[PDB]
Design a protein around this ligand. Structure first.
Ligand SMILES: [Ca+2]
Length: 238
């Protein structure tokens, strides 16, 4: 059964983040299903020292000790300029105030991004809380080649565990592209992580510069769902 469904509208998201010159809007011309989708844009601005999130938030993403499925459709601009930097397209993230690790208390766990023409993801495990900030980031590269100007469909099946009892499975355009079992997929606490979808141009800030010449970046989203079965969240079926 689905706990969340969004057909490509502003309505139903808890929060809309349009950092700096970013936009998030509803469009009817570039749509995966129905008559609406969301368009996220970000624009590089030399001098700016802040971050570049254009995202919509579903606050109830996960809590450790459950299995969930997540599905969404996304599309890069047809003229997407593939570059080695990261452009993040979805993430799970919790605010963990008082954890005392790193530069603030927001910790993204699993993230999904484009690097060159490849879909990357990761999960995080460990403790990341004083007096032990020990945490491990497992990156899973090259999950799929991503074509520009086409709707792609992503399904995740994740059992969120800090034990070696979790699992982490990903489908891309209807095909299983990754699965691994008996792994720890989140940190060992009970924070509730948000599920965000949207263009987060993280390398622009992290790296101190932009690689290439496409400072105006566009990604569309549609058909986002959270539920307990594959069919609940698969954008490619009802
Ligand atoms: Ca739609």
């Amino acid at each position: 059964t689905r706990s969340f469904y969004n057909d490509g509208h502003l309505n139903g998201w808890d929060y809309v983040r349009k950092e700096n010159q970013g936009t998030v809007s509803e469009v009817s011309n570039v749509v995966f299903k129905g008559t609406s989708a969301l368009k996220m844009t970000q624009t590089y601005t030399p001098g700016y020292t802040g971050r570049y999130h254009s995202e919509v938030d579903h606050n109830r993403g996960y809590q450790r000790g459950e299995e969930q499925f997540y599905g969404f459709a996304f599309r890069l601009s047809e003229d997407w300029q593939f570059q080695p930097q990261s452009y993040n397209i979805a993430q799970f993230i919790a605010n963990r105030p008082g954890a005392g690790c790193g530069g603030d208390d927001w910790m993204p766990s699993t993230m999904i991004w484009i690097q060159n023409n490849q879909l990357y993801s990761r999960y995080v495990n460990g403790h990341y809380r004083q007096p032990n900030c020990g945490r491990n980031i497992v990156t899973r590269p090259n999950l799929a080649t991503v074509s520009a100007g086409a709707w792609h469909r992503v399904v995740l099946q994740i059992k969120w565990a800090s034990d070696n009892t979790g699992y982490f499975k990903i489908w891309f355009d209807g095909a299983k592209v990754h699965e691994e079992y008996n792994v720890a997929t989140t940190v060992d606490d009970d924070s509730v992580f948000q599920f965000r979808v949207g263009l987060y141009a993280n390398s622009w800030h992290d790296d101190g510069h932009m690689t290439g010449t496409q400072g105006f970046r566009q990604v569309w989203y549609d058909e986002v769902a959270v539920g307990t079965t594959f069919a609940d969240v698969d954008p490619d079926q009802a």
